[PDB]
Amino acid sequence: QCDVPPNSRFDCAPDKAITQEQCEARGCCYIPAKQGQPWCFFPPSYPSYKLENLSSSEMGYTATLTRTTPTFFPKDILTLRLDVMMETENRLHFTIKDPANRRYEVPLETPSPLYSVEFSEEPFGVIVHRQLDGRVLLNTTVAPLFFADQFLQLSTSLPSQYITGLAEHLSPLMLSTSWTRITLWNRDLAPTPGANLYGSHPFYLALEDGGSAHGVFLLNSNAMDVVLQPSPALSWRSTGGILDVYIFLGPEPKSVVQQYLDVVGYPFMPPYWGLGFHLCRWGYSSTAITRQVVENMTRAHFPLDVQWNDLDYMDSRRDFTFNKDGFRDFPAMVQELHQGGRRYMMIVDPAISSSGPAGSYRPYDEGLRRGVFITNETGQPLIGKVWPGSTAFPDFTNPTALAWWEDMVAEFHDQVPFDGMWIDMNEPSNFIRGSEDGCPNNELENPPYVPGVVGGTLQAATICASSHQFLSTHYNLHNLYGLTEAIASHRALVKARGTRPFVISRSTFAGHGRYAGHWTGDVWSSWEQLASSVPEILQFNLLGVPLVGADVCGFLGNTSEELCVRWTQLGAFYPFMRNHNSLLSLPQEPYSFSEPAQQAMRKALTLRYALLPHLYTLFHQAHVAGETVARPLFLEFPKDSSTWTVDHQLLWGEALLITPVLQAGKAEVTGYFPLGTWYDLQTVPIEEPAIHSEGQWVTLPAPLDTINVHLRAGYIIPLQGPGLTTTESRQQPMALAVALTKGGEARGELFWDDGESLEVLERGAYTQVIFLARNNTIVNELVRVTSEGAGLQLQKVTVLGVATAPQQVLSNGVPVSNFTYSPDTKVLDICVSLLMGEQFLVSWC
Numbered sequence: 134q135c136d137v138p139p140n141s142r143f144d145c146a147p148d149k150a151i152t153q154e155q156c157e158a159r160g161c162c163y164i165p166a167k168q169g170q171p172w173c174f175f176p177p178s179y180p181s182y183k184l185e186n187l188s189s190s191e192m193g194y195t196a197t198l199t200r201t202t203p204t205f206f207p208k209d210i211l212t213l214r215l216d217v218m219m220e221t222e223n224r225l226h227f228t229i230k231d232p233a234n235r236r237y238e239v240p241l242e243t244p245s246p247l248y249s250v251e252f253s254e255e256p257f258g259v260i261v262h263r264q265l266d267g268r269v270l271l272n273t274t275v276a277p278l279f280f281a282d283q284f285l286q287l288s289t290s291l292p293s294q295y296i297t298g299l300a301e302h303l304s305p306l307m308l309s310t311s312w313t314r315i316t317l318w319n320r321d322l323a324p325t326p327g328a329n330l331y332g333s334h335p336f337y338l339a340l341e342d343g344g345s346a347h348g349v350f351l352l353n354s355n356a357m358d359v360v361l362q363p364s365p366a367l368s369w370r371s372t373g374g375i376l377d378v379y380i381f382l383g384p385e386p387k388s389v390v391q392q393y394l395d396v397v398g399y400p401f402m403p404p405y406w407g408l409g410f411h412l413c414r415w416g417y418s419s420t421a422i423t424r425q426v427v428e429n430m431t432r433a434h435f436p437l438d439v440q441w442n443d444l445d446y447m448d449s450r451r452d453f454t455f456n457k458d459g460f461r462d463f464p465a466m467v468q469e470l471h472q473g474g475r476r477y478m479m480i481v482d483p484a485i486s487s488s489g490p491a492g493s494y495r496p497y498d499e500g501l502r503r504g505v506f507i508t509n510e511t512g513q514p515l516i517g518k519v520w521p522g523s524t525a526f527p528d529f530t531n532p533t534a535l536a537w538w539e540d541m542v543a544e545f546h547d548q549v550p551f552d553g554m555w556i557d558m559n560e561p562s563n564f565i566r567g568s569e570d571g572c573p574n575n576e577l578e579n580p581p582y583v584p585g586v587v588g589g590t591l592q593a594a595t596i597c598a599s600s601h602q603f604l605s606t607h608y609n610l611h612n613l614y615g616l617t618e619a620i621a622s623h624r625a626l627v628k629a630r631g632t633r634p635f636v637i638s639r640s641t642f643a644g645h646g647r648y649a650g651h652w653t654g655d656v657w658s659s660w661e662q663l664a665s666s667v668p669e670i671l672q673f674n675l676l677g678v679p680l681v682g683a684d685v686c687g688f689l690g691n692t693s694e695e696l697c698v699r700w701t702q703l704g705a706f707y708p709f710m711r712n713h714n715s716l717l718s719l720p721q722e723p724y725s726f727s728e729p730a731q732q733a734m735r736k737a738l739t740l741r742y743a744l745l746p747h748l749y750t751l752f753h754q755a756h757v758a759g760e761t762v763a764r765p766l767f768l769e770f771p772k773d774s775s776t777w778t779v780d781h782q783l784l785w786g787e788a789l790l791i792t793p794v795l796q797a798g799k800a801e802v803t804g805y806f807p808l809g810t811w812y813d814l815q816t817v818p819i820e821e822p823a824i825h826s827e828g829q830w831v832t833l834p835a836p837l838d839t840i841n842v843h844l845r846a847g848y849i850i851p852l853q854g855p856g857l858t859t860t861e862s863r864q865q866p867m868a869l870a871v872a873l874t875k876g877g878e879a880r881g882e883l884f885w886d887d888g889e890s891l892e893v894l895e896r897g898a899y900t901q902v903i904f905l906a907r908n909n910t911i912v913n914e915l916v917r918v919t920s921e922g923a924g925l926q927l928q929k930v931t932v933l934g935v936a937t938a939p940q941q942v943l944s945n946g947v948p949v950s951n952f953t954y955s956p957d958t959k960v961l962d963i964c965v966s967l968l969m970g971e972q973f974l975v976s977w978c
């Protein structure tokens with residue numbers, strides 16, 4: 134009975150240190166490890182639930198689950214209901230609930246399948262096969278089902294050692310299965326390994342031998358541990374709610390992500406300007422200093438779309454105010470930014486100063502009157518401590534709080550016309566434990582199982598777990614705090630401005646990308662954090678939050694010039710690109726460095742700006758089809774298993790491979806090149822030529838002034854001319870880069886709209902064009918053409934992989950004004966006067 138191989142031992146004492154005698158008295162097996170792996174573990178006979186009265190419906194299956202012998206946790210729910218819903222050919226959904234009591238559930242809006250589902254009777258389990266090859270994807274029979282009031286555990290075998298997801302943590306893209314405990318409890322902590330960080334996303338994607346994959350989402354917002362072991366297998370261990378489980382069949386990893394996003398929401402479409410460069414620090418302490426940033430960037434020809442402020446603008450660090458010393462003329466500063474074609478962003482905190490004289494601070498006084506705050510045992514506002522001092526915490530599950538937040542945002546916007554909201558401290562972060570008045574002693578504050586959270590308590594760095602919100606207690610709702618503020622702020626900005634919102638949030642939960650973007654928080658200015666930003670940006674793209682990045686050059690500490698060059702090079706490929714800096718750090722704006730470093734930084738921004746029409750098209754694909762913007766090599770080439778562990782390179786979309794230097798003192802880099810021809814993007818004019826790979830590692834020159842970017846053969850990228858803002862760049866002529874296959878084929882596309890309006894796709898207010906290269910011709914195909922796309926000038930076409938110099942180049946049947954061909958690089962560069970919205974044919978021979 135206790136002959137269980139070491140890797141398949143499931144922990145029977147997750148709750149406390151246990152002796153052999155106590156272990157055996159639990160009905161469990163005791164075998165010390167020989168050097169983590171639990172010593173006390175479940176025999177195959179350990180009491181679980183039994184399946185009874187299974188029946189079938191058009192929808193799927195239902196059954197009763199009964200437990201006869203209590204577990205060692207209090208308040209087992211002995212009778213449960215199983216509902217299995219076979220929702221689409223790719224999505225299976227099951228719930229396990231208490232039929233006798235409504236339990237907390239996360240608020241979320243709603244030929245043969247690829248899966249089959251079977252059941253084990255005793256012990257109970259759910260078994261999910263992939264129909265095509267019979268691979269077992271889920272098998273929950275591997276360990277007991279626990280379902281007690283404050284402890285749910287469900288386990289499964291995994292199909293391979295390769296699993297990604299379960300944000301937010303500082304780790305490789307692929308998670309370690311060597312007895313790893315991953316804790317989801319939103320927490321204000323500077324990113325560091327092994328810790329629960331700012332967000333929680335209870336989703337994983339698991340790879341399968343041969344390159345197929347599936348995904349599993351547990352729709353549960355309670356504090357939870359996910360435990361991975363090397364058999365391989367996984368256990369979800371949550372502290373409340375129900376088991377609400379989705380399985381996404383893929384089979385392609387890209388399809389798994391899209392299917393997940395079909396449930397939680399497709400990413401929101403940002404405004405075009407939001408893809409420009411953003412620049413911020415804590416310490417721009419007046420409007421005069423802040424204006425100097427734009428002046429100094431402009432003088433040195435650095436693009437900058439959006440100027441930001443941190444807390445500096447506020448009156449005594451309070452939301453919806455501005456001080457009358459350094460920021461006396463705040464409204465005029467922001468108006469002037471707009472006059473120059475730029476946008477403005479500033480920090481907003483959730484917590485509202487509660488200490489001012491009554492009647493002197495409207496956000497608090499109104500919030501009090503309307504009952505918008507989270508309250509404590511006696512029904513008064515829970516008071517904690519954040520930047521302004523004593524603060525109350527809005528309850529963004531309360532519809533009245535939603536209205537109050539809309540009003541506060543609209544009123545402040547009437548004074549100062551900011552263009553979005555940077556929402557910070559929304560875990561919610563508390564500088565003291567729980568509240569000024571501590572927390573009561575109850576089961577929510579002191580639960581029977583505490584997940585592996587930093588500080589060993591749910592109260593640490595946050596508010597009391599038993600505090601009251603409109604929908605439920607904070608215990609159940611904590612991991613949604615940031616998300617609910619993001620929803621509230623999205624709506625507030627729609628109402629205040631009437632154009633697309635731009636929200637960047639620290640704390641997140643699954644589905645966040647439907648409303649907002651994210652940055653990775655208070656990362657150190659170190660080579661280590663530069664490198665760790667690549668897997669983290671990739672993770673968030675898999676989780677449907679493509680508008681993500683890290684603070685360029687790092688936030689905490691002092692950057693070095695070399696680090697800031699490399700970070701700016703890589704960071705130009707973050708889908709959200711902002712350089713932000715702490716109060717006590719040395720300056721790190723691009724213009725603050727030496728001339729050579731400035732040149733490298735300028736080149737990085739210039740290239741990003743040239744690529745914006747393409748980056749924006751990629752965001753449109755994310756928004757309409759659940760695609761990723763930045764993606765790991767394995768998403769694009771899953772059938773090449775050498776890609777599975779690669780997380781220090783990234784793709785933009787299908788075709789642009791970025792291979793950054795991530796260490797000090799390097800003048801070369803070694804990166805993986807999937808099967809195909811990869812053209813060096815440096816061979817395209819912007820204002821070894823080709824890697825022929827069999828699927829292999831390649832060492833590339835990478836001096837300080839260089840980042841390696843390659844374009845995949847078969848693809849066409851739209852580009853646009855330069856500007857210091859998107860207001861300027863959007864008016865410039867466009868260009869194509871056309872990467873030919875050996876056989877002469879390529880394809881690409883452009884999506885174009887006005888860059889900020891709401892409901893564009895619903896109203897058809899956009900242009901969509903496909904580009905095709907074939908048989909020594911390049912044409913466009915006009916999927917949709919509207920006024921918004923009209924008048925886009927195409928002035929340059931660059932063709933890569935042209936083997937022989939042409940004797941003639943034609944544009945709509947007329948020999949072109951001029952072209953150049955480089956026999957060394959195989960590049961044909963063609964000057965044209967064409968329109969993206971009008972059918973054209975370019976040819977050469």
Ligand SMILES: *[C@@H]1O[C@H](CO)[C@@H](O[C@@H]2O[C@H](CO)[C@@H](O[C@@H]3O[C@H](CO)[C@@H](O)[C@H](O[C@H]4O[C@H](CO)[C@@H](O)[C@H](O)[C@@H]4O)[C@@H]3O)[C@H](O)[C@H]2NC(C)=O)[C@H](O)[C@H]1NC(C)=O
Nearest residue numbers: 487508509510511512513514515516568569570571572573
């Ligand atoms: C729920 O939240 C509310 C706030 O919304 C919270 O109210 C707070 O209650 C405490 C007392 O429980 C108040 O603290 C008092 O403040 C007064 C005046 O400043 C003092 O005179 C009081 O001193 C007493 O306690 C001292 C101990 O250090 C003794 O030495 C002294 O002799 C007094 O007996 C005391 O500090 C606090 O001011 C309010 N907060 C606000 C903003 O009004 C309430 O406690 C919360 N409820 C629960 C159950 O947590």
Ligand SMILES: *[C@@H]1O[C@H](CO)[C@@H](O[C@@H]2O[C@H](CO)[C@@H](O[C@@H]3O[C@H](CO)[C@@H](O)[C@H](O)[C@@H]3O)[C@H](O)[C@H]2NC(C)=O)[C@H](O)[C@H]1NC(C)=O
Nearest residue numbers: 177253255256258260261262269271272273274275276290
């Ligand atoms: C899902 O996982 C469960 C649990 O791991 C698997 O069920 C278990 O399968 C093993 C091996 O097939 C069984 O062990 C064997 O039992 C036979 C019969 O007595 C014995 O002769 C062998 O020595 C061996 O011990 C075990 O009985 C069985 N457990 C249960 C509860 O049924 C199951 O195979 C997995 N399902 C799939 C489709 O992979």
Ligand SMILES: *[C@@H]1O[C@H](CO[C@@H]2O[C@@H](C)[C@@H](O)[C@@H](O)[C@@H]2O)[C@@H](O[C@@H]2O[C@H](CO)[C@@H](O)[C@H](O)[C@H]2NC(C)=O)[C@H](O)[C@H]1NC(C)=O
Nearest residue numbers: 183184185186187188196197198199200211212213214232
């Ligand atoms: C499993 O179901 C049986 C039978 O329930 C009957 O028909 C079902 C389709 C549904 O319509 C039920 O309402 C029915 O009762 C349960 O056994 C019955 O239990 C009731 C109440 O305890 C009793 O009066 C009947 O005599 C029982 N009938 C039989 C044939 O035994 C049984 O309790 C269910 N098991 C579990 C664990 O819930």
Ligand SMILES: *[C@@H]1O[C@H](CO[C@@H]2O[C@@H](C)[C@@H](O)[C@@H](O)[C@@H]2O)[C@@H](O[C@@H]2O[C@H](CO)[C@@H](O)[C@H](O)[C@H]2NC(C)=O)[C@H](O)[C@H]1NC(C)=O
Nearest residue numbers: 657658659688689690691692693715716717718719720721
């Ligand atoms: C980041 O650097 C600041 C400033 O460092 C100073 O200026 C540099 C150009 C260089 O010449 C340094 O050696 C200088 O010390 C640090 O703040 C300083 O800290 C030191 C030591 O604690 C103190 O004596 C200075 O007075 C501080 N100066 C200022 C302007 O604050 C800061 O410590 C550095 N941060 C980290 C994490 O190392």
Ligand SMILES: *[C@@H]1O[C@H](CO)[C@@H](O[C@@H]2O[C@H](CO)[C@@H](O)[C@H](O)[C@H]2NC(C)=O)[C@H](O)[C@H]1NC(C)=O
Nearest residue numbers: 417421422423424425426427428429720722725
């Ligand atoms: C913008 O650039 C100006 C000019 O370089 C900076 O002003 C100088 O700052 C240095 C400090 O390093 C002083 O010693 C000089 O006296 C200043 N020169 C002038 C002409 O004022 C300014 O600090 C920069 N501002 C920002 C916000 O980066």
Ligand SMILES: [Cl-]
Nearest residue numbers: 151152153154
């Ligand atoms: Cl012992």
Ligand SMILES: [Cl-]
Nearest residue numbers: 155158159205
């Ligand atoms: Cl016990």
Ligand SMILES: [Cl-]
Nearest residue numbers: 236237604605
């Ligand atoms: Cl509830």
Ligand SMILES: [Cl-]
Nearest residue numbers: 247263265384
């Ligand atoms: Cl399949």
Ligand SMILES: [Cl-]
Nearest residue numbers: 415715716717
């Ligand atoms: Cl700081």
Ligand SMILES: [Cl-]
Nearest residue numbers: 779780781782
């Ligand atoms: Cl890698």
Ligand SMILES: [Cl-]
Nearest residue numbers: 793794795796
């Ligand atoms: Cl490197």
Ligand SMILES: [Cl-]
Nearest residue numbers: 944965966967
């Ligand atoms: Cl022409």
